[PDB]
Amino acid sequence: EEDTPLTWDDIPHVHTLSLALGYRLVHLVNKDQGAPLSQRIRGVRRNLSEQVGFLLPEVRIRDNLSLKPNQYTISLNGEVIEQGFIEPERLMAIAVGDTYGEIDGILGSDPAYQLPAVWIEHQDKAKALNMGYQVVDDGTVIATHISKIMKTNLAELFTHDDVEAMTQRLTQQAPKLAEALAAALNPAQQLKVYRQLLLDQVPLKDIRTIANTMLESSENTKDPILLAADVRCALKRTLVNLIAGQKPELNVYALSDELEQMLLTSLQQAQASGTVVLDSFPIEPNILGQFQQNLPLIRQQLKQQGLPPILLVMPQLRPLLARYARTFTQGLAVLSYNEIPENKQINVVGNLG
Amino acid sequence: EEDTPLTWDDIPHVHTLSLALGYRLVHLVNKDQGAPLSQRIRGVRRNLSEQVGFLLPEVRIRDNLSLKPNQYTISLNGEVIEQGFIEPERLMAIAVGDTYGEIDGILGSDPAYQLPAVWIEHQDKAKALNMGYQVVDDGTVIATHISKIMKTNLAELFTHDDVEAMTQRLTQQAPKLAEALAAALNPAQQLKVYRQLLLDQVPLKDIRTIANTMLESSENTKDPILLAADVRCALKRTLVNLIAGQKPELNVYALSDELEQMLLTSLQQAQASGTVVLDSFPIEPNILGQFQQNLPLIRQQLKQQGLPPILLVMPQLRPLLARYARTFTQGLAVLSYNEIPENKQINVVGNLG
């Protein structure tokens, strides 16, 4: 009543990641009933931090009664991105596709990868564990969802303030490099580069061999898409090691010489303007529908054989097609030619007409 | 009599928001009779502050005998904007449209949204509450009116002094961003951008992901309408989340290819001059009457189906049509194409001939 001063502080900040927790599943943060979403959530936030190099933000957790008593929503920067439904006390199990037999569990879905799911009681673990199922506790069904959301939205999770912390962690290793890098690219320019690297989900663990490449290639162009190409050409090793396995033989698609040429025409035309697009899209010659059609099949065709999906392109089209594979197909990999080692021999599968 | 020095201080300042309180309803601020307009008014000024991000001004309250003993006027920056009439002691109830039955209450109107209203005694609440009505105390009839006035005039409520407080509240989060933003856009330039964002009523809660976008896009253009487009493309998520619901399917209008083209002609023509208008209006080819005619129907046609009103345009016409929907229709939403996610599939309703 005597809040007679309202101050800007009364306005609550917004947070990058936040969890909404409905009634039936608030027995997960209460610090007594073996709160998983203070360790399991840190489990993901660590076993993914140390993997992608930069400390992922702190997942905050709130419980808005506004929603159904047994659901949760994950919010990126202000508001929901994905919203799942948790069974009251029936643990979920997944059948990868090699498991056989079913259990009495109520059908559901996998909120992570859109797989069929059965929600089984706490006792039937044996029947799941002895039939070959992939059972998971309640909290993990969330934590895996948060992991997928982080791994997808990696870009927006990298703030204009980590670019300070990255240079700190890099001065710890090569203290003379940053002192020569920060004077070559102002942090506004650096961040765009890390954004372009994290969009296509490239790990920034070995920051030295990344600042080295930015410092090198900074002379020619300060464009943050020509720079993100060079860093990827320098990380070709870990790129392919993460996309495909250590098997030297490699299977991938390739652009159809016709369609591939048809695009380069568009880029050259748009080159009339001052590269109005960086490379994300210069021209939409109505083949965008053809793409939005094939790229799902392109993922699925290679998912008729089990091998991970990859796609080869010209380097000049590399940065473009990354945007499509980032929106249309939830899973893909667009690699250039020079981004693949001369060690791993590749095997084209076919064109795309 | 010995006020022999008259000093500039004797001149009373003017205030952004101020309330006028006639006789019959001064029993609302007197601090004894459960003064609602020191808590309810703060109720709105808080549950709207924390929503739109920036601390709304302090509503001042005065009682000029000049007016009828039972009316009130709300004043923005010097003088009345809206003026309501309060029944002596008969509480008002509203029938949303789904409620059935009437009560003895004297007819009136809803000062908020122009709805039919009945003013009932304090006892008939049950008959209202058991018939399905929306009854409200005297003070709330005001407080809701103040809320509507704030939510409409948000722009003029954002002073050239908050741009200091916004950077303070943003240094609290990303202290290295402002120190790199304030050196990129002088506060005179920043404010115009926040003005353009608040005109179409976009929340500024997540200031980090807004300064980030202004800092980014500041290289190309310092025009505060090309900047307000990029911030909205970056907030597309919360934009649509606030206009429509979380339902992925979406229904909206679209410009008639003919009329849409007819405007772009006008913009290109005006491009002869140095973009004499930012984008609010380059050319009035007498289709302004057609607009002032349709936009009311455009609101109402979609109010024949209950779904919230939206309108799609070209991005190059986006900033223009925002001015019309800000004046002609008290409620509308003009969204571009790139301002809508690729997640929510849209459903056009029809052109506008």
Residue numbers in the entry:
A (entry chain A), B (entry chain B): 343 to 695
Wording from the paper:
Type III secretion systems (T3SS) are bacterial macromolecular machines that facilitate transport of protein substrates across the bacterial cell envelope. The FlhA/SctV cytoplasmic domain is known to form a nonameric ring underneath FliPQR-FlhB/SctRSTU, but the full-length FlhA/SctV complex remains poorly characterised. Open and closed states have been described, with the open state being competent for chaperone-substrate complex binding, while the closed state has been proposed to be responsible for binding early substrates.
Out of the identified proteins we chose FlhA from the lateral flagella of Vibrio parahaemolyticus (Vp-FlhA) and SctV from Yersinia enterocolitica (Ye-SctV) for further studies, as both could be produced in large quantities at high purity using the gentle detergent LMNG. In contrast, Vp-FlhA was found to form the predicted nonameric complex and we imposed C9 symmetry for particle refinement, resulting in a 3.8 Å volume of the cytoplasmic domain but little detail in the transmembrane domain. A striking feature of both structures is the N-terminal density of the cytoplasmic domain, formed by FlhAL/SctVL, which reaches out to bind to the adjacent protomer, demonstrating this well studied interaction for the first time in the context of the full-length protein in both flagellar and injectisome T3SS. This residue in FlhA has previously been shown to be involved in ring formation of the cytoplasmic domain of FlhA. Comparison of our structures with FlhA from S. Typhimurium, St-FlhA, in the open state and Sf-SctV, which is in the closed state shows that both of our complexes are in the open state, with Ye-SctV being the first example of an SctV homologue in the open state. We simulated the movement of FlhAL by overlaying one subunit of Vp-FlhA onto the SD3 or SD2 subdomain of the closed Sf-SctV structure. Our structures also suggest that at least in the open state the residues known as FlhAL/SctVL, which have previously been described as the linker between cytoplasmic and membrane domains, do not form part of this linker but are part of the cytoplasmic domain.
